[PDB]
Amino acid sequence: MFKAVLFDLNGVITDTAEYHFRAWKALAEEIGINGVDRQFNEQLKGVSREDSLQKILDLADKKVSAEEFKELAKRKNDNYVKMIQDVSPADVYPGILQLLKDLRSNKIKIALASASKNGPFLLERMNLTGYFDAIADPAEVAASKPAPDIFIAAAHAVGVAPSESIGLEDSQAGIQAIKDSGALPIGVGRPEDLGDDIVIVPDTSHYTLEFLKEVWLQKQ
Ligand code: BEF
Ligand SMILES: [Mg+2]
Ligand SMILES: [Mg+2]
Known part of the structure; x- marks a missing residue:
């Protein structure tokens, strides 16, 4: 898994x-x-x-x-x-806190792979910091999305290979960055924007641990 x-x-x-x-x-x-x-x-x-x-x-x-x-x-x-x-x-957003809780309860690592230079602040304001094992610093990567750097960094920071990871993204550039890192993308949005070769959910309420597991098992 x-x-x-x-x-x-x-x-x-x-x-x-x-x-x-x-x-x-x-x-x-x-x-x-x-x-x-x-x-x-x-x-x-x-x-x-x-x-x-x-x-x-x-x-x-x-x-x-x-x-x-x-x-x-x-x-x-x-x-x-x-x-x-x-x-x-x-x-x-809907579903996200429950997902974070369920990941943590199952000992699955949680990392931030955001372009935001306000990521740590925003997670503190939302009371989410305690769920995160790492935040990849966008100031320390050589290239922005669609380059994979930030996702590689996020995975490595929590002691995993990207190939052991799922990435969650709403943007085409983000999806490409996940793909190129070696991680498995699951998009939120529509295929017109994100591509038709990946799994996409309509909104974040569909990001459940059970769904992520289903996606991972189908990938094999
Ligand atoms: F926070 Be992401 F880079 F939209
Ligand atoms: Mg330019
Ligand atoms: Mg985004």
Whole structure:
């Protein structure tokens, strides 16, 4: 049986997307750029901070220096960090706490494999830290998703090979990173985004220990 589960954070454990959206919208309002609404924000999901800022500048054909660019990106981040201060246990997605409890009770390792530089903070705010055996630090990997680095790191940190692990992800790049690590992906979302060659569940309430076991046994 699998020995570890490698969890992404955003779209698996909780949603930070609302806060990202609000942070960008506030920045755009401050600098006078129209058009940063919820529909536009879909173009920012899974996009780097710098590429997201550039998309917003492009709305106004706005040109800035490297130092101005850096400062704007910083201000967005400051907005975001302020906005996540009220994250709480109520923000944990359905099924996730029970899964964490059941993994722990069965001595299956639990690791975070998130791109978030606020991962430890967010897990503390949600009261989840006690379930995690390790958090892979995204600042210490050489390459971001879809590179496998973060999943390799997460598995190794809990003393397992990726081949002994399941990865849980909501993004295409995440799924590719799990695949390339050697771990078994189980997506949450739709195959249009994630691919049709992996198991996908419609929402996190389907991530149960019994389901993970079923998936692992079918893989063999
Ligand atoms: F937290 Be993951 F990188 F969406
Ligand atoms: Mg995610
Ligand atoms: Mg690039």
